[PDB]
Amino acid sequence: MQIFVKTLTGKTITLEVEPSDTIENVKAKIQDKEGIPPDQQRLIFAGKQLEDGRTLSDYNIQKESTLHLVLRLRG
């Protein structure tokens, strides 16, 4: 299954995922393509913030869903 992530540059990347992957698994896949560490990633879907221990299916994230990556700065 493929999903898309609108990254910090505004470009779009594609991830190979499975329906039960956690948000932290997704974050790991994002750090591989983009070089943003997971602790600094905030993932947003249908306007909503996604939580680490929940799964894609928990949010009914299906194939070709786009997630939006935002920097989490905790200064």
> Which spans of this chain sit near its own copies (rule: CB under 8 A)?
1-2, 63-64, 73, 75
Asked if 18 touches Cl ion (CB under 5 A), the answer is yes
Tally: H helices and E strands in the chain: 1, 5
Contact 68, 45 (CB under 8 A): yes
**Pairing mode of beta strands 48-49, 12-16:** unpaired
**Pairing mode of beta strands 2-6, 12-16:** antiparallel
| CA–CA separation, 47 and 43 (whole Å) | 10
Smaller CB distance to Co ion: residue 1 or 8?
A: 1
Stretch that binds Mg ion, among 1-9, 24-32, 43-51, 65-73 (CB under 5 A): 1-9
Asked if 1 touches Co ion (CB under 5 A), the answer is yes
Smaller CB distance to Cl ion: residue 25 or 72?
A: 25
Q: Contact residues for Cl ion (CB under 5 A)?
A: 18
Q: Contact residues for Co ion (CB under 5 A)?
A: 1
